[PDB]
Design an enzyme around this catalytic site. Sequence first.
Site, PDB file in Angstrom:
ATOM      1  N   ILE A 176       0.810  -1.222   0.000  1.00 22.39           N
ATOM      2  CA  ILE A 176       0.000   0.000   0.000  1.00 22.39           C
ATOM      3  C   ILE A 176       0.851   1.284   0.000  1.00 22.39           C
ATOM      4  O   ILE A 176       0.433   2.293  -0.565  1.00 22.39           O
ATOM      5  CB  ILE A 176      -0.954   0.070   1.207  1.00 22.39           C
ATOM      6  N   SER A 230      -8.228   4.292  -6.271  1.00 25.68           N
ATOM      7  CA  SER A 230      -7.255   4.441  -7.337  1.00 25.68           C
ATOM      8  C   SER A 230      -6.760   5.879  -7.278  1.00 25.68           C
ATOM      9  O   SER A 230      -7.546   6.812  -7.413  1.00 25.68           O
ATOM     10  CB  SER A 230      -7.915   4.157  -8.684  1.00 25.68           C
ATOM     11  N   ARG A 231      -5.465   6.070  -7.068  1.00 22.46           N
ATOM     12  CA  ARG A 231      -4.927   7.419  -6.850  1.00 22.46           C
ATOM     13  C   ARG A 231      -4.665   8.228  -8.115  1.00 22.46           C
ATOM     14  O   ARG A 231      -4.560   9.455  -8.042  1.00 22.46           O
ATOM     15  CB  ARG A 231      -3.637   7.363  -6.039  1.00 22.46           C
ATOM     16  N   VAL A 232      -4.545   7.552  -9.264  1.00 17.21           N
ATOM     17  CA  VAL A 232      -4.174   8.213 -10.529  1.00 17.21           C
ATOM     18  C   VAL A 232      -5.102   7.901 -11.722  1.00 17.21           C
ATOM     19  O   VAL A 232      -5.021   8.549 -12.789  1.00 17.21           O
ATOM     20  CB  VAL A 232      -2.727   7.860 -10.927  1.00 17.21           C
ATOM     21  N   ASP A 273      -0.289   2.635  -6.294  1.00 20.69           N
ATOM     22  CA  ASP A 273      -1.038   3.848  -6.538  1.00 20.69           C
ATOM     23  C   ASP A 273      -2.494   3.677  -6.140  1.00 20.69           C
ATOM     24  O   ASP A 273      -3.362   4.329  -6.688  1.00 20.69           O
ATOM     25  CB  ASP A 273      -0.927   4.198  -8.021  1.00 20.69           C
TER      26      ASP A 273
END
Lengths: 266, 118, 121, 239, 252, 252, 126, 122, 49
Positions: free
Chosen positions: E90, E119-121, E94
């Site tokens: 983690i 989902s970071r991107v 991403d």
Amino acid sequence: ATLKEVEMRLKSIKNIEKITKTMKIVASTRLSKAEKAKISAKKMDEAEQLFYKNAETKNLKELIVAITSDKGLCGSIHSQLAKAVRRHLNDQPNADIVTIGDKIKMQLLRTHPNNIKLSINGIGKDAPTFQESALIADKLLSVMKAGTYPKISIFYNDPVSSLSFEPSEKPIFNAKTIEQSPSFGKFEIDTDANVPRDLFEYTLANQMLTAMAQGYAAEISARRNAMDNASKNAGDMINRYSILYNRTRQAVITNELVDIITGASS
Amino acid sequence: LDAAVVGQEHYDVASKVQETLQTYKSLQDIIAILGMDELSEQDKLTVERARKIQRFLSQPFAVAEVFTGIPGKLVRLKDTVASFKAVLEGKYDNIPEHAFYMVGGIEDVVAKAEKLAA
Amino acid sequence: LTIAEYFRDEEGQDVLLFIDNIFRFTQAGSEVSALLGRIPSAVGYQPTLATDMGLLQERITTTKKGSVTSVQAVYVPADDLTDPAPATTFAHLDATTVLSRGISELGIYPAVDPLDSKSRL
Amino acid sequence: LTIAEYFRDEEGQDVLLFIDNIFRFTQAGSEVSALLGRIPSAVGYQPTLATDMGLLQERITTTKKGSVTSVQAVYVPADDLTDPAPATTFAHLDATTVLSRGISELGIYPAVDPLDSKSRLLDAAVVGQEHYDVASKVQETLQTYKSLQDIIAILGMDELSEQDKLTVERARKIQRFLSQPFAVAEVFTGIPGKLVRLKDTVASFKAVLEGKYDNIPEHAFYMVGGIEDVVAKAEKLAA
Amino acid sequence: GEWFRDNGKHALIVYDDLSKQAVAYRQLSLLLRRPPGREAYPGDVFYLHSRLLERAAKLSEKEGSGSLTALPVIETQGGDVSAYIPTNVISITDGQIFLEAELFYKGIRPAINVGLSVSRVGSAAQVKALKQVAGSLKLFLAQYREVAASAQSDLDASTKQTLVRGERLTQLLKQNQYSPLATEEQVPLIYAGVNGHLDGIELSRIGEFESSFLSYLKSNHNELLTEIREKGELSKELLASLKSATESFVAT
Amino acid sequence: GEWFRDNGKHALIVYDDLSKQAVAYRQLSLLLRRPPGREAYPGDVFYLHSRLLERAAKLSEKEGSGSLTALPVIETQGGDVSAYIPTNVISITDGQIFLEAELFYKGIRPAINVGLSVSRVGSAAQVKALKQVAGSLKLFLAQYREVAASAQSDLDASTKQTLVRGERLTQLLKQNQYSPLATEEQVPLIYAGVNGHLDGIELSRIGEFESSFLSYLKSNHNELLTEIREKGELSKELLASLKSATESFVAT
Amino acid sequence: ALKQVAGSLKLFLAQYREVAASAQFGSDLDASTKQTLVRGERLTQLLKQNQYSPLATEEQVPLIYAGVNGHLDGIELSRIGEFESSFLSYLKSNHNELLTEIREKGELSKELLASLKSATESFVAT
Amino acid sequence: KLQFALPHETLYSEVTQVNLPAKSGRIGVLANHVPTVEQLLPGVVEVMEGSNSKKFFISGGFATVQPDSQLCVTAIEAPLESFSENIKNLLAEAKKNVSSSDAREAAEAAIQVEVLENLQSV
Amino acid sequence: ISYAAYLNVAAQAIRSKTELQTASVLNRSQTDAFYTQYKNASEPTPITK
């Protein structure tokens, strides 16, 4: 984060669990015994308040009696009833108050300290009996002079199902109010010995027993219901802490081993 | 965090906020097992209030616009102090919890409360 | 297992292999590993816990000639299912048969628990 | 101990050996064990923890030449009675007075754990059937209360059986009756110490168990001598 | 995987699973007599993953625009995402798709716990059509979870609606294995959920609804699916036309 | 012990205790610098005890029918049977007699925790008579400790009964130290309880009941006792005889 | 002086928390218990103290004195802070000879007790 | 029809004759009786549906003939021949002795005397 | 005494044979209720009604 903590924090909840789970069965044994008192009470009231229906009796200062009990762990029985007294009692900030059961007191004591002139104690143990209903009535006449009031009102929880209830109100009429009615003449009552005096005093006792019997069975249903949700909710935490316990226990064995290991290497 | 730096009003608010939140913490176990019903009125009100503070402490950052869906708000210190001061003073008790969640100052609560009530 | 493999590889049969108890296989390797001077891993199991397990399990499979299928009795230490021994074992299990006294004490034989017993297939 | 032994063997007389604190012997040997070249044992202690202790303890003893009565204070690391050190000490003793944090915090001194403290002499053949029965009942009473305390925080008192209410009510008295001002302790009590003879203690507690003092306030058992003292304190508080 | 990346092409790499890679690495380190740390893993067990996963990337125009995408798999014990190895990974990737065993046993599969998934991107890289019918679905759903958890103290009015929509989108999100679905097959189902056209339909039939609804769309309103597929957006007109075909089917 | 076993006889060996023996062996091993493991024990501490304990055995008829029976003792710390040495020994042996301070302080002595004690051998090793009367004892007590938390007003006549019975059967299992009972003394006591002859007897008087009842059987019914002892089973005539003689006494 | 006025403060405060434990499950207490619950809640309040605001024994003593005896029970809880400073100023202007005495003689006699008892009782009515 | 109701037990909830002990007089409810309300003092009560005759014992309470022409009985405690020398006169010699002297409680145990006489009435 | 309470005394003389004196009869003939008159806050002695 230490084993001792997690193991004993577990031992608080595991009992909380088992206990709340017991009083759901003790609540269930008490359930039928009290569904029975509610049936016997109504049936008696049905024979008594049917006369008031025919006489078409209405109401031409005030006494309010609100009924619950001493014990909590029964959900919002004391709360939304207290709230029903707040809604109604907006019209009468000068209505004298007698409370049955300490929980409706701490509700009504904190909202209106002064209206409470009388408070009853040790109520919601077993089902209500006539003696209780009577001696409480007796004192409402004694020091509270229940006779000398324009309107009287009993507050209690009616049980609709085993899942919900409704805070209800029902009125009480006195010696005077019975006489001057739309249809007192329908009945051939003997106008000699103080009859309306008695039918009021007898009804004061009865309509309370009937309010308490309903308030009790509402309470008992609400207990078995709140405790079911609690024992469920407890087990959930027991599950979440049995997992943390297990992590910590493993960690303890590893960490202890690493010291032995470092010690052995040198 | 010292009165000789931030002023007594600031200190007093921060601390009462902190006392409030703390009361909720000491209670969490009982709230989760037995629900709100088994609190005294004092407690019930503090818990009711703490949760409004809890949410009011949340703030839409500009750089997390993608995850908030909301433009980044920014609150002047003097406004934070006063806004919280008022919540404690029981001035916003009638407001539903949701109106403090992900906003700026107290003007923004008022706004979102009326937005919900329409 | 070698005896079981001969029936598969040479006689072409579908063969049962019982291992009672699979946890005692693990503990033995934990103990051999310790006598060999190897630094213990998590919870005191051998650092080779998983490969030790693989070297046994991966031999129980279906070839084109037959299969050795294995019924392995599984002890759970502290009744903790995340303990590295069951955890490693479970990785290889395709099904469980759960025998319960609670099924037995209702006079049901075999005392298999229909809700507890689970299969990937 | 060497001094003590000499009186026992060549003075032919009852010696008294007081040791505070025997834990510190095991700790000390522990502090040098690594530098002595040893692989450590569990919980950090020396591999020789137990045999070390036997060598010392098995000397502290009554022989056929003479008698030694030894009393050893035994520290318990972080209150954990299962820490190897106190845990290896238990089996060397004929009597174990176990002090307790939960009791001290209740303001009860000495904080002796009435259930966890044991004696080789608590035996009818020794103390008499009466004495034994009184102790037994006292212990069942307290245990029942310790048991019920789980309820008494969630249901309060009110859901309790008549018989059990009586027990719990008697238990809380008995629990306080087991406290005593010490003469050595006046500084922390502001109360003149008391000594209480055995025959009184038995009589006193026996009487309480029969209920011949259920009418008497709780605070009247706390930090006093024998049953005389309790009847005095009740009258003062009544005035 | 990198060959594709460095030669203007794209590769997906699944690491099934890293938990087991880490365990093997631990075996090697302890036999190498490296000092056991937390959970007995060496100090470099993070660097193990981090260097591996850093190799996933999307490259610039100048570097040919290739990409390597990583899907590492980690296995929690007793659902604890706070263990050492989980938190290590983690802190590299991403985002996470967290799968709950609780949902899995209930029959909710994929058992994606939305509260705990992120989902970071990827939001950037989402197909617009989905992005448009995913209006707040992120916020709403994982928040219907607010009501849902509380639900089992009042038979409310306002918050009885979100309990009925919530339950619907929860079924819409279910999906059989080996049956991946095209974007243009996806956006209608979500549109039909988000705008409450399922509110009236029972739970036990939301499964059948979905297969029957896609058939309807293919045979009768294929022009529109094609438009979703080819432009990837929802023009006001296609949005309005989609409203049309939805209402029709539901009524019957 | 084995001299007895190897020569057609029967020895009982008590190892008081194996906790302390494992400590001794750990001393030797650590000081010989053999590798340490869990709790600093050597990898052959399981082998020590199993090597030791498999020597207790019931020999075949060919080999003389000799036997050696072992009572190993283990001390736990805080009742933690997952400790390294109790684990080893619990699994090596054929069952556990589990003692507990809690019970002890309540006056239940021996402080045997029924629900945690077992003998995998079981019935095969019990006098038939005791097996006949005890059949249900296993049961009532099981059902007792399940409904225990109820022992604290409103309970149906079903539960009031279950509770009445169990209290008394528990009390019957108390026993003084140094006073072991003959089988023929045990079965009638167990029988009275198991069958409800103690229900109407105030809980404090179960002790003096046992004493009196035994002596009464000894003066008046030496025949029943002699049969129980000499035959090991109870015929329906013995049972009936036992039933009569009990009620006879309970009334009196 | 401090020893005298802080009688069983430490044990009392324990008896207070013994009770602040029974108050949790929504109890209703008899006269003694509700009062000592009130007393301790205020005693606790009197133990609060600002940093860099240390006090002399002769300032400490009157505070603890007023507290334990119950000259604070019938005062609204949130105002014990302003009581502490108003009162120490009051005793510095009116009954200053008292504070002077405690600083020098480190002890109390009936005369010091009754003066202060009479002095505190005075201030309570603001 | 008849409805007899104690608060702990509902007894009777078509009829031809019923017998109550009213204000003073003992009314035998006629089939088409004009609605009438009268108190019930201690005494016996009988019901009819054919030639079926059977009594109870009443503590006290209210009887109301209604506009539906039905009867309604309510007491607090109720048989007497089938719920009964040894039972009866027990604390009746403890009735007069705790009569008694003076406080005001004398009045509550004076309510016992007049009641026991008309309880051993039949 | 009053018409309700009067009836009760004749319902406890009616209530007090030990054989038909079943469990839920003795219950009805008892009560642990304390009446307290509450002034202003609280007032006088709680007495067992």
